[PDB]
């Protein structure tokens, strides 16, 4: 199974994925680039890109969900989920680093692919796209850095509160408790105890696979 450190590392690297306002390409530009971007379709379970391999280029999700995970297929830990509009591959390429997690289609999915040659050509010939990419990279890694900074030295319950608030999409968190624990350098039983307490105080609801935030203001106060 992947070590806690491998899971922690992959999960925080996966928090630098481009999304919404932070995405490196404007939607208008993704459209204009149709003859450069390759359309790639994935059945559920199919690999988009492998861990420990150099990025073949930049991936953009057009529809479906891509799971990001570490560990062998059997002992898999999911560290993040890419939604439509999300972009990955570009920061590792800029760091000259291999991917540290595997992306697998969760649902049927379609991804646009910008190969590394096309990427280099694009930045070299379209200064406006390059300039936006620069602000995007800065925004994405700085946002991750700010989340980490804010949790240092804080008691574990406050860290879990903050992590939940930051992870939430439409007030829902669908990550495993083992992964949440690894992100905080903690053990699953510790996270579970804190989640039970938050549940008793009516801050969250913990279903089978999902945590829902039921009182955001109350949870913010626990984050300190
Ligand atoms: Cl996998």
How many angstroms separate the CA atoms of 174 and 214, rounded? Answer: 15
Q: Does 211 carry a binding-site annotation?
A: no
**36 within 8 A of 110, measured Cβ to Cβ:** no
State both tokens at 164.
């939940």
CA of 20 relative to ligand 1 center, distance in Å: 25
What is the spatial order of strands in the sheet that 66-70 belongs to?
Answer: 47-49, 102-105, 66-70, 77-82
Q: Does 218 carry a binding-site annotation?
A: no
Q: Does 217 carry a binding-site annotation?
A: no
**195 within 8 A of 156, measured Cβ to Cβ:** no
CA of 24 relative to ligand 1 center, distance in Å: 25
Q: Which residues, listed in sequence order, are joined to residue 67 by a DSSP beta bridge? A: 81, 104
CA of 170 relative to ligand 1 center, distance in Å: 26
How many angstroms separate the CA atoms of 157 and 52, rounded? Answer: 34
Q: Does 39 carry a binding-site annotation?
A: yes
How many angstroms separate the CA atoms of 77 and 67, rounded? Answer: 10
What is the spatial order of strands in the sheet that 211-213 belongs to?
Answer: 172-173, 211-213, 204-206
Angle, CA 221 vertex, CA 168 and CA 82 arms, to 5°: 10
Angle, CA 176 vertex, CA 9 and CA 161 arms, to 5°: 80
How many angstroms separate the CA atoms of 164 and 191, rounded? Answer: 11
Q: Does 197 carry a binding-site annotation?
A: no
Resolution, angstroms, 1 dp: 1.8
State both tokens at 17.
């994925």
How many angstroms separate the CA atoms of 72 and 150, rounded? Answer: 32
CA of 22 relative to ligand 1 center, distance in Å: 26
Matching residue, tokens 């008793």: 200
Q: Does 129 carry a binding-site annotation?
A: yes
CA of 55 relative to ligand 1 center, distance in Å: 16
Q: Does 166 carry a binding-site annotation?
A: no
CB under 5 Å of ion ligand 1: residues: 69, 102, 104
């Amino acid at each position: 199974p992947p070590s806690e450190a491998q899971v922690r590392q992959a999960a925080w690297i996966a928090r630098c994925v481009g999304r919404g306002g932070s995405a490196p390409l404007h939607r208008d530009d993704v459209s204009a680039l149709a003859e450069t971007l390759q359309v790639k379709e994935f059945a559920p379970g199919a690999v988009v890109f492998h861990a420990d391999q150099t990025a073949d280029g930049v991936w953009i999700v057009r529809h479906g969900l891509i799971e990001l995970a570490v560990g062998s297929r059997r002992r898999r830990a999911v560290v993040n989920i890419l939604h439509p509009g999300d972009v990955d591959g570009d920061i590792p390429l800029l760091l000259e680093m291999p991917m540290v997690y595997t992306g697998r289609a969760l649902t049927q999915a379609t991804c646009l692919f910008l190969d590394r040659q096309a990427f280099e050509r694009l930045l070299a010939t379209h200064p406006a796209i390059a300039r936006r990419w620069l602000s995007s990279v800065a925004q994405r890694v700085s946002t991750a850095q700010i989340r980490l900074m804010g949790m240092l030295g804080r008691p574990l319950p406050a860290q879990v509160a903050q992590l939940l608030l930051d992870e939430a999409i439409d007030a829902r968190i669908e990550l495993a408790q083992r992964t949440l624990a690894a992100m905080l350098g903690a053990q699953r039983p510790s996270i579970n105890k804190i989640l039970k307490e938050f549940e008793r105080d009516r801050l969250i609801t913990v279903g089978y696979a999902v945590i829902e935030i039921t009182d955001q203001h109350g949870l913010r106060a626990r984050a300190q």
